[PDB]
Design an enzyme around this catalytic site. Structure first.
Site, mmCIF file in Angstrom:
data_model
loop_
_atom_site.group_PDB
_atom_site.id
_atom_site.type_symbol
_atom_site.label_atom_id
_atom_site.label_comp_id
_atom_site.label_asym_id
_atom_site.label_seq_id
_atom_site.Cartn_x
_atom_site.Cartn_y
_atom_site.Cartn_z
ATOM 1 N N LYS A 13 3.285 50.086 95.691
ATOM 2 C CA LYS A 13 2.048 50.715 96.106
ATOM 3 C C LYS A 13 1.348 49.767 97.072
ATOM 4 O O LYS A 13 0.949 48.661 96.689
ATOM 5 C CB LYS A 13 1.149 51.009 94.876
ATOM 6 C CG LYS A 13 0.152 52.142 95.074
ATOM 7 C CD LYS A 13 -0.635 52.411 93.815
ATOM 8 C CE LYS A 13 -1.470 53.661 93.924
ATOM 9 N NZ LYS A 13 -0.743 54.847 93.410
ATOM 10 N N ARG A 15 -1.614 49.630 100.563
ATOM 11 C CA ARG A 15 -2.992 50.133 100.694
ATOM 12 C C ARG A 15 -3.063 51.636 101.002
ATOM 13 O O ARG A 15 -3.994 52.304 100.560
ATOM 14 C CB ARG A 15 -3.775 49.336 101.750
ATOM 15 N N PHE A 16 -2.065 52.163 101.735
ATOM 16 C CA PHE A 16 -2.060 53.557 102.195
ATOM 17 C C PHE A 16 -0.971 54.462 101.623
ATOM 18 O O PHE A 16 -1.007 55.674 101.861
ATOM 19 C CB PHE A 16 -1.908 53.528 103.715
ATOM 20 C CG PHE A 16 -2.955 52.688 104.412
ATOM 21 C CD1 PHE A 16 -4.301 53.042 104.362
ATOM 22 C CD2 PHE A 16 -2.600 51.539 105.110
ATOM 23 C CE1 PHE A 16 -5.268 52.268 105.007
ATOM 24 C CE2 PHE A 16 -3.570 50.775 105.760
ATOM 25 C CZ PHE A 16 -4.898 51.141 105.702
ATOM 26 N N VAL A 19 5.761 53.566 97.440
ATOM 27 C CA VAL A 19 7.138 53.263 97.798
ATOM 28 C C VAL A 19 8.023 53.622 96.622
ATOM 29 O O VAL A 19 7.745 53.236 95.488
ATOM 30 C CB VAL A 19 7.353 51.793 98.242
ATOM 31 C CG1 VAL A 19 8.788 51.594 98.732
ATOM 32 C CG2 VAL A 19 6.354 51.395 99.340
ATOM 33 N N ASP A 133 -1.571 41.658 108.300
ATOM 34 C CA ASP A 133 -1.638 41.690 106.850
ATOM 35 C C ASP A 133 -0.463 40.961 106.234
ATOM 36 O O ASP A 133 0.141 41.449 105.300
ATOM 37 C CB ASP A 133 -1.791 43.120 106.304
ATOM 38 C CG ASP A 133 -2.338 43.205 104.866
ATOM 39 O OD1 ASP A 133 -2.940 42.215 104.392
ATOM 40 O OD2 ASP A 133 -2.190 44.267 104.240
HETATM 41 N N1 LIG Z 1 12.202 48.576 101.748
HETATM 42 C C1 LIG Z 1 11.932 48.320 100.462
HETATM 43 N N2 LIG Z 1 12.981 48.141 99.631
HETATM 44 C C2 LIG Z 1 12.751 47.746 98.381
HETATM 45 C C3 LIG Z 1 11.451 47.556 97.881
HETATM 46 C C4 LIG Z 1 11.182 47.144 96.475
HETATM 47 C C5 LIG Z 1 12.204 46.683 95.634
HETATM 48 C C6 LIG Z 1 11.935 46.248 94.347
HETATM 49 C C7 LIG Z 1 10.642 46.262 93.840
HETATM 50 C C8 LIG Z 1 10.361 45.829 92.425
HETATM 51 C C9 LIG Z 1 10.341 46.998 91.465
HETATM 52 O O1 LIG Z 1 10.302 46.568 90.148
HETATM 53 C C10 LIG Z 1 9.624 46.734 94.653
HETATM 54 C C11 LIG Z 1 9.889 47.188 95.940
HETATM 55 N N3 LIG Z 1 10.384 47.761 98.683
HETATM 56 C C12 LIG Z 1 10.598 48.128 99.970
HETATM 57 C C13 LIG Z 1 9.375 48.299 100.832
HETATM 58 O O2 LIG Z 1 9.471 48.651 102.009
HETATM 59 N N4 LIG Z 1 8.215 48.034 100.202
HETATM 60 C C14 LIG Z 1 6.882 48.047 100.678
HETATM 61 C C15 LIG Z 1 6.491 48.608 101.907
HETATM 62 N N5 LIG Z 1 5.218 48.601 102.338
HETATM 63 C C16 LIG Z 1 4.291 48.034 101.549
HETATM 64 C C17 LIG Z 1 4.579 47.403 100.350
HETATM 65 C C18 LIG Z 1 5.903 47.405 99.908
HETATM 66 N N6 LIG Z 1 6.317 46.687 98.763
HETATM 67 C C19 LIG Z 1 6.981 45.403 99.009
HETATM 68 C C20 LIG Z 1 7.827 45.070 97.836
HETATM 69 O O3 LIG Z 1 7.034 44.986 96.600
HETATM 70 C C21 LIG Z 1 6.208 46.162 96.357
HETATM 71 C C22 LIG Z 1 5.442 46.658 97.586
#
Ligand SMILES: Nc1ncc(-c2ccc(CCO)cc2)nc1C(=O)Nc1cnccc1N1CCOCC1
Length: 297
Positions: A13, A15-16, A19, A133
């Site tokens: 999650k 700000r906008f 995921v 950011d």
């Molecule tokens: N391409 C991706 N592939 C995998 C994951 C991912 C993989 C594992 C987990 C842990 C779960 O238990 C979370 C997230 N996230 C993204 C992504 O684009 N995230 C993303 C995009 N914009 C804003 C915030 C973001 N996040 C950054 C990662 O952490 C959360 C928020």
């Protein structure tokens, strides 16, 4: 026209948007924006759609889609999925090696240098982007333990058509904890871009400190804490950050014992220059990328 996607799990999650880990009929990330956040979706879409942005340290983009729902409409961004998740979560759980620090630090500096660059590695012109950011929770850890940039919702394309008045409000954009002293002070030279590149370098310095703080090459490693964790509240305001970063000239602590390791000493000297009060005294992301390549023996 729409891709055969099945959403599995809410993984993040921003700000906008939300995921999701999803199945593409294989594993992809789907970032879902409600209609209200259309502008953020469009901003990211425009950056991810630029062919000149493609880099190993920038999140791989598949496509953007508009999806009608019963309740209305959602705006999607489909990208590569990085199972290891974000750098803040990674550093909270793990104590990293000197090798891990070198790979994570150098890939972060390379990714930022590529965003900031007015040219592709092959010399072709490209639009510089300022992230605006940058923070450990916005940086993805790839399976090979290198960094990967995402979350361009607040990013700015350094377009020659940009007006001085448009950049005014706008206003203070980003996460207060990672804002440069000149951003906290409302002291930016809106007359010249590249001043925006310097704010990204400051945020990068704090992230490099976070990586360093969890590296076993320092000797004794403490439990992970975000920058200024012991001085400010969980979600600090610009005023509380300004009191620390600007008024007290406060920066995350670098104990003298960390400097016993030659590599750690070089990383610390570099990140210290990058979080200087004066934006002009900061190294460029390209300079940092070069210093990390010098760390190769
Ligand atoms: N391409 C991706 N592939 C995998 C994951 C991912 C993989 C594992 C987990 C842990 C779960 O238990 C979370 C997230 N996230 C993204 C992504 O684009 N995230 C993303 C995009 N914009 C804003 C915030 C973001 N996040 C950054 C990662 O952490 C959360 C928020």
């Amino acid at each position: 026209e729409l891709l055969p996607i099945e959403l599995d799990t809410l993984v993040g999650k921003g700000r906008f948007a939300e995921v999701y880990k999803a199945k593409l009929k294989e594993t992809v990330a789907v970032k879902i924006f409600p209609y209200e956040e259309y502008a953020s979706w469009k901003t990211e879409k425009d950056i991810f759609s630029d062919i000149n942005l493609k880099h190993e340290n920038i999140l791989q983009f598949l496509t953007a889609e508009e999806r009608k729902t019963e309740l209305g409409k959602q705006y999607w961004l489909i990208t590569a999925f990085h199972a290891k998740g974000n750098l803040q979560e990674y550093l909270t759980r793990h104590v990293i090696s000197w090798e891990d620090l070198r790979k994570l630090g150098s890939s972060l500096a390379r990714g930022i240098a590529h965003l900031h660059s007015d040219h592709t590695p092959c010399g072709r012109p490209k639009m510089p982007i300022v992230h605006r950011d940058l923070k450990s929770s916005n940086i993805l850890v790839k399976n090979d333990l290198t960094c990967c940039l995402c979350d361009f919702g607040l990013s700015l394309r350094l377009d020659p058509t940009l007006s001085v008045d448009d950049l005014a409000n706008s206003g203070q954009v980003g996460t207060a904890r990672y804002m440069a002293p000149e951003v906290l002070a409302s002291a930016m030279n809106l007359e010249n871009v590249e001043s925006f590149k310097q704010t990204d370098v400051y945020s990068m310095a704090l992230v490099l400190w976070e990586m360093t703080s969890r590296c076993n090459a320092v000797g004794e490693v403490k439990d992970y804490e975000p920058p200024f964790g012991s001085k400010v509240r969980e979600h600090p305001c610009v005023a509380s950050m300004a009191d620390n970063v600007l008024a007290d000239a406060g920066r995350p602590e670098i104990p003298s014992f960390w400097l016993n390791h030659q590599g750690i000493q070089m990383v610390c000297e570099t990140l210290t220059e990058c979080w200087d009060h004066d934006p002009e005294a900061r190294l460029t992301a390209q300079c940092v990328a070069e210093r990390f390549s010098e760390l190769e023996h």
